[PDB]
Coordinates of C-alpha atoms and ligand atoms in Angstrom, one line a residue:
Chain A
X24 CA -4.5 3.7 11.9
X25 CA -2.6 0.8 10.4
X26 CA -2.9 2.8 7.2
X27 CA -1.0 5.7 8.7
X28 CA 1.8 3.5 10.1
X29 CA 2.1 2.1 6.6
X30 CA 2.4 5.6 5.2
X31 CA 5.0 6.6 7.8
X32 CA 7.2 3.6 6.9
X33 CA 6.8 4.5 3.2
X34 CA 8.1 8.0 3.9
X35 CA 10.9 6.6 6.1
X36 CA 12.2 4.4 3.3
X37 CA 11.9 7.2 0.8
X38 CA 13.7 9.8 2.9
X39 CA 16.3 7.3 4.0
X40 CA 17.1 6.8 0.3
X41 CA 16.9 10.6 -0.4
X42 CA 19.6 11.2 2.3
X43 CA 21.9 8.7 0.7
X44 CA 21.4 10.2 -2.8
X45 CA 22.1 13.7 -1.6
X46 CA 25.1 12.6 0.4
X47 CA 26.5 10.8 -2.7
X48 CA 26.0 13.8 -4.9
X49 CA 27.7 16.0 -2.3
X50 CA 24.8 18.3 -1.4
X51 CA 24.9 17.2 2.3
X52 CA 27.7 16.6 4.8
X53 CA 28.3 13.3 6.5
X54 CA 27.6 14.7 10.0
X55 CA 24.2 16.0 8.8
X56 CA 23.3 12.7 7.3
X57 CA 24.5 10.8 10.4
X58 CA 22.4 13.0 12.7
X59 CA 19.3 12.7 10.4
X60 CA 19.9 8.9 10.4
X61 CA 19.7 9.0 14.2
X62 CA 16.3 10.8 13.9
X63 CA 15.4 8.0 11.4
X64 CA 16.1 5.5 14.2
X65 CA 13.7 7.4 16.4
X66 CA 11.0 7.5 13.7
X67 CA 11.3 3.7 13.3
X68 CA 10.9 3.3 17.0
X69 CA 8.0 5.8 17.0
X70 CA 6.3 3.8 14.2
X71 CA 6.7 0.6 16.2
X72 CA 5.1 1.8 19.4
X73 CA 2.4 3.8 17.5
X74 CA 3.7 7.3 18.4
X75 CA 2.3 8.9 15.1
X76 CA 3.1 12.4 16.2
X77 CA 6.7 11.8 17.0
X78 CA 7.1 9.8 13.8
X79 CA 5.5 12.5 11.7
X80 CA 7.6 15.3 13.1
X81 CA 10.8 13.2 12.8
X82 CA 10.0 12.7 9.1
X83 CA 9.4 16.4 8.5
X84 CA 12.8 17.1 10.1
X85 CA 14.5 14.4 7.9
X86 CA 12.9 15.8 4.8
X87 CA 13.9 19.3 5.7
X88 CA 17.4 18.0 6.2
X89 CA 17.6 16.0 3.0
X90 CA 16.6 19.1 1.1
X91 CA 19.2 21.3 2.8
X92 CA 16.5 23.3 4.6
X93 CA 17.6 23.1 8.2
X94 CA 21.0 23.2 9.9
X95 CA 23.2 20.6 11.5
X96 CA 22.4 22.3 14.9
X97 CA 18.7 22.2 14.2
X98 CA 18.9 18.5 13.4
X99 CA 20.7 17.8 16.7
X100 CA 18.2 19.9 18.6
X101 CA 15.2 18.1 17.0
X102 CA 16.8 14.7 17.7
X103 CA 17.2 15.4 21.5
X104 CA 13.7 16.8 21.6
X105 CA 12.2 13.8 19.7
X106 CA 14.1 11.1 21.7
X107 CA 12.9 12.7 24.9
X108 CA 9.4 13.1 23.6
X109 CA 9.3 9.5 22.5
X110 CA 10.3 8.5 26.1
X111 CA 7.0 9.8 27.4
Chain B
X25 CA -3.0 19.5 2.9
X26 CA -2.8 15.8 2.2
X27 CA -2.5 16.4 -1.5
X28 CA 0.4 18.8 -1.4
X29 CA 2.2 16.3 0.9
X30 CA 1.5 13.4 -1.5
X31 CA 2.7 15.5 -4.5
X32 CA 5.9 16.2 -2.7
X33 CA 6.4 12.5 -1.8
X34 CA 6.0 11.6 -5.5
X35 CA 8.5 14.3 -6.7
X36 CA 11.1 13.0 -4.3
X37 CA 10.3 9.4 -5.4
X38 CA 10.5 10.2 -9.1
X39 CA 13.6 12.3 -8.8
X40 CA 15.3 9.3 -7.3
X41 CA 13.8 6.9 -9.9
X42 CA 15.0 9.1 -12.8
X43 CA 18.6 8.9 -11.6
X44 CA 18.4 5.2 -10.9
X45 CA 17.2 4.5 -14.5
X46 CA 19.8 6.8 -16.0
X47 CA 22.6 5.0 -14.1
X48 CA 21.5 1.5 -15.0
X49 CA 21.3 2.5 -18.7
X50 CA 17.5 2.3 -19.1
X51 CA 17.0 5.9 -20.0
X52 CA 18.9 8.3 -22.2
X53 CA 20.5 11.4 -20.8
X54 CA 18.3 13.6 -23.0
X55 CA 15.1 12.0 -21.8
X56 CA 16.2 12.4 -18.2
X57 CA 17.2 16.0 -18.8
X58 CA 13.7 16.8 -20.3
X59 CA 12.0 15.0 -17.4
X60 CA 14.1 17.0 -14.9
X61 CA 12.8 20.2 -16.5
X62 CA 9.2 18.9 -16.0
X63 CA 10.1 18.2 -12.4
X64 CA 11.1 21.8 -12.0
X65 CA 7.6 22.7 -13.3
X66 CA 6.1 20.3 -10.7
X67 CA 8.3 21.7 -7.9
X68 CA 6.9 25.2 -8.8
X69 CA 3.3 24.0 -9.3
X70 CA 3.4 22.5 -5.8
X71 CA 4.8 25.7 -4.3
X72 CA 2.2 27.7 -6.2
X73 CA -0.7 25.4 -5.3
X74 CA -1.4 24.4 -8.9
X75 CA -2.2 20.8 -8.0
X76 CA -3.5 19.7 -11.3
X77 CA -0.4 20.9 -13.1
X78 CA 1.7 19.1 -10.4
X79 CA -0.3 15.9 -10.8
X80 CA 0.0 15.8 -14.6
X81 CA 3.7 16.7 -14.5
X82 CA 4.4 13.8 -12.2
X83 CA 2.4 11.4 -14.5
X84 CA 4.6 12.4 -17.4
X85 CA 7.8 12.0 -15.3
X86 CA 6.7 8.6 -14.1
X87 CA 5.9 7.5 -17.7
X88 CA 9.3 8.9 -18.8
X89 CA 11.1 7.0 -16.0
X90 CA 9.5 3.8 -17.0
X91 CA 10.3 4.3 -20.7
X92 CA 6.7 4.6 -21.6
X93 CA 6.8 7.9 -23.4
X94 CA 9.1 9.0 -26.2
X95 CA 11.6 11.8 -26.1
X96 CA 9.5 13.9 -28.5
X97 CA 6.4 13.2 -26.4
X98 CA 8.2 14.3 -23.3
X99 CA 9.3 17.5 -25.0
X100 CA 5.7 18.1 -26.1
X101 CA 4.3 17.4 -22.7
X102 CA 6.7 19.8 -21.1
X103 CA 5.6 22.6 -23.5
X104 CA 1.9 21.9 -22.8
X105 CA 2.6 21.8 -19.1
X106 CA 4.8 24.9 -18.8
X107 CA 2.1 26.9 -20.7
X108 CA -0.6 25.4 -18.5
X109 CA 1.2 26.7 -15.4
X110 CA 1.1 30.3 -16.6
Chain C
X20 CA -7.6 -2.3 1.2
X21 CA -9.7 0.7 0.1
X22 CA -10.9 -1.1 -3.0
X23 CA -9.4 -1.3 -6.5
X24 CA -9.9 2.4 -7.1
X25 CA -7.5 4.4 -9.3
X26 CA -6.2 6.1 -6.2
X27 CA -5.3 2.8 -4.5
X28 CA -3.7 1.5 -7.7
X29 CA -1.7 4.7 -7.9
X30 CA -0.6 4.2 -4.3
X31 CA 0.4 0.6 -4.9
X32 CA 2.5 1.7 -7.9
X33 CA 4.3 4.4 -5.8
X34 CA 5.2 1.6 -3.4
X35 CA 6.5 -0.6 -6.2
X36 CA 8.6 2.3 -7.5
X37 CA 9.9 2.9 -4.0
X38 CA 10.8 -0.7 -3.4
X39 CA 12.4 -1.0 -6.9
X40 CA 14.8 1.8 -5.7
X41 CA 15.4 0.2 -2.3
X42 CA 16.3 -3.2 -3.8
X43 CA 19.0 -1.5 -5.9
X44 CA 20.2 0.7 -3.1
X45 CA 20.6 -2.4 -0.9
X46 CA 22.0 -4.6 -3.6
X47 CA 24.7 -2.0 -4.3
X48 CA 25.8 -1.6 -0.7
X49 CA 26.1 -5.4 -0.4
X50 CA 23.1 -5.9 1.9
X51 CA 21.2 -8.1 -0.6
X52 CA 22.3 -10.8 -3.0
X53 CA 21.7 -11.0 -6.7
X54 CA 19.5 -14.1 -6.4
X55 CA 17.4 -12.4 -3.6
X56 CA 16.8 -9.3 -5.8
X57 CA 16.0 -11.5 -8.8
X58 CA 13.4 -13.4 -6.8
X59 CA 12.1 -10.1 -5.4
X60 CA 11.7 -8.8 -9.0
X61 CA 9.7 -11.8 -9.8
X62 CA 7.3 -10.9 -7.0
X63 CA 7.4 -7.3 -8.4
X64 CA 6.2 -8.7 -11.7
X65 CA 3.4 -10.4 -9.9
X66 CA 2.6 -7.2 -8.1
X67 CA 2.5 -5.3 -11.4
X68 CA -0.1 -7.6 -12.9
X69 CA -2.1 -7.6 -9.7
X70 CA -2.2 -3.7 -9.6
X71 CA -3.3 -3.7 -13.2
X72 CA -6.0 -6.3 -12.6
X73 CA -7.3 -4.6 -9.5
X74 CA -6.1 -7.4 -7.2
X75 CA -5.1 -5.0 -4.4
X76 CA -4.7 -7.7 -1.7
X77 CA -2.4 -9.8 -3.8
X78 CA -0.4 -6.6 -4.6
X79 CA -0.2 -5.4 -1.0
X80 CA 1.0 -8.9 0.0
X81 CA 3.7 -8.9 -2.6
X82 CA 4.8 -5.4 -1.6
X83 CA 5.0 -6.4 2.0
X84 CA 7.2 -9.4 1.1
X85 CA 9.4 -7.3 -1.2
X86 CA 9.8 -4.7 1.6
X87 CA 10.7 -7.3 4.2
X88 CA 13.2 -8.8 1.7
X89 CA 14.8 -5.4 0.9
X90 CA 15.3 -4.7 4.6
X91 CA 17.1 -8.1 5.0
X92 CA 14.3 -9.5 7.2
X93 CA 13.4 -12.7 5.3
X94 CA 15.5 -15.4 3.8
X95 CA 16.0 -16.2 0.1
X96 CA 14.0 -19.4 0.8
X97 CA 11.1 -17.5 2.2
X98 CA 11.1 -15.1 -0.7
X99 CA 11.0 -18.0 -3.2
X100 CA 8.2 -19.6 -1.2
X101 CA 6.3 -16.4 -1.1
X102 CA 6.7 -15.9 -4.8
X103 CA 5.2 -19.4 -5.5
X104 CA 2.2 -18.7 -3.2
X105 CA 1.5 -15.3 -4.6
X106 CA 1.6 -16.4 -8.2
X107 CA -1.0 -19.0 -7.4
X108 CA -3.2 -16.8 -5.3
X109 CA -3.4 -14.6 -8.4
Ligands
ZN201 ZN1 4.3 10.9 2.9
ZN202 ZN1 11.3 16.0 0.2
ZN203 ZN1 1.7 9.1 -5.7
ZN204 ZN1 6.3 4.5 -11.6
ZN205 ZN1 2.5 2.4 0.7
ZN206 ZN1 10.5 -0.6 4.1

């Protein structure tokens, strides 16, 4: 299971860099990247306490966002759902 | 599928690495442009489930990003790869 | 690790590519210093050789140090210390 936490952190670093690249080249808006970066905060916390499922879903969302595949509203929705689901 | 997921991770990674090594002057624009065409072939080979084409395409991109394959060799690899997809 | 298989070596190389990028990202935005990155790159050179030679444990250790450095979590003095230890452990 340490292997999966390792993988999750690898993807978090990768997608965090992808967000910054696609912000710099103008493909994404600042608000979108800020909201995705808040999900990245949740994934980091999820990784800490072992919540693989929350972390994995958060990463899927951040990847979808970095690739312009989901909306600002969908990112805000997923963030609230993920934060609350991490609380349990 | 674990493999498709890994393939997508590597295409993200190598897309970033290619720009990094263009911007710091390590790679020529023309090499990076040819590698970016291979990355399109990988993006497709992933979507299409042609995993071996995806994996070889990423190996060529990685070699290109590290300056380990010549411009002519990248051009030839892309031809061999594009054909191998169809 | 899972042994010095081609699959593990390939994973270690992915991580090194990823951390190569992160060091530059975080040098450029001012998070990391030039001397920190230079020392981290000397660990990256040790990691490279370790990956080649199948020394997955030495490589995983250098990657963990480089990662901790890139996130601003260990001091320049710790990175230098880690580089000396890792070069010897190899
Ligand atoms: Zn992944
Ligand atoms: Zn992606
Ligand atoms: Zn890989
Ligand atoms: Zn590489
Ligand atoms: Zn890794
Ligand atoms: Zn990291």
